[PDB]
């Protein structure tokens, strides 16, 4: 009988699965993966000041806003791809199709 007890990702992890890392790209809205934190957005260098015992950030909605690169130890930001809404202006099909 062996018991395994562990705690999930809240601090810098040390044991991971066998997965290979790719290059780091910034200023293009991509879908990323940091130690199992999956998402989508734009990455840019930040001005935040993380203390050594720490690597993540949060907003009032409790969603990640910054992250410490697990290979270079630099602070990045997260921001969704730009989006919006669309409206169509028409004079009426009885009059025209423009």
């Amino acid at each position: 009988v062996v018991v395994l007890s562990f705690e999930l990702l809240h601090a810098p992890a040390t044991v991971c699965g066998p997965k290979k890392s790719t290059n780091l790209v910034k200023n293009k809205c991509v879908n990323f993966n940091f130690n199992g934190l999956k998402g989508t957005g734009v990455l840019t260098e930040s001005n935040k000041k993380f203390l050594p015992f720490q690597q993540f950030g949060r907003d009032i909605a409790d969603t990640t806003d910054a992250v410490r690169d697990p290979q270079t130890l630099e602070i990045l930001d997260i921001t969704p791809c730009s989006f919006g809404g669309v409206s169509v202006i028409t004079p009426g099909t009885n009059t025209s199709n423009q």
Binding site: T44, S46, K48, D59, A61, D77, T79
Partner: protein
């Protein structure tokens, strides 16, 4: 109560008080997803919502059209009395309107 040509906006010296005393959320609409950058985001309260899916639409009459309307009302009333509201405007001296 009459408009002041000297200021860039043509408000009155009382409408200026009324505008400096009421603190709005974000005057104007300049965000347009071209402002919320780096640490400038997650600190302002406008970006924190625009990133969630909640947006604000601008009104149809700008703040400079409503001032024109009120100036028209004042000019009409002080130059013609109650006649301009029930037909064509007819002029009359003011100290003969108070009578």
């Amino acid at each position: 109560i009459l408009p002041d040509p000297s200021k860039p906006s043509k408000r009155s010296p009382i409408e200026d008080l009324l505008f400096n005393k009421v603190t709005l959320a974000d005057a104007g609409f300049i965000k347009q997803y071209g402002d919320c950058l780096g640490d400038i985001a997650a600190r302002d309260l406008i970006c924190a919502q625009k990133f969630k899916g909640l947006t604000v639409l601008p009104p149809l009459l700008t703040d400079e059209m409503i001032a024109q309307y009120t100036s028209a009302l004042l000019a009409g009333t002080i130059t013609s009395g109650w006649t301009f509201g029930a037909g064509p405007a007819l002029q009359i001296p003011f100290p003969m309107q108070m009578a």
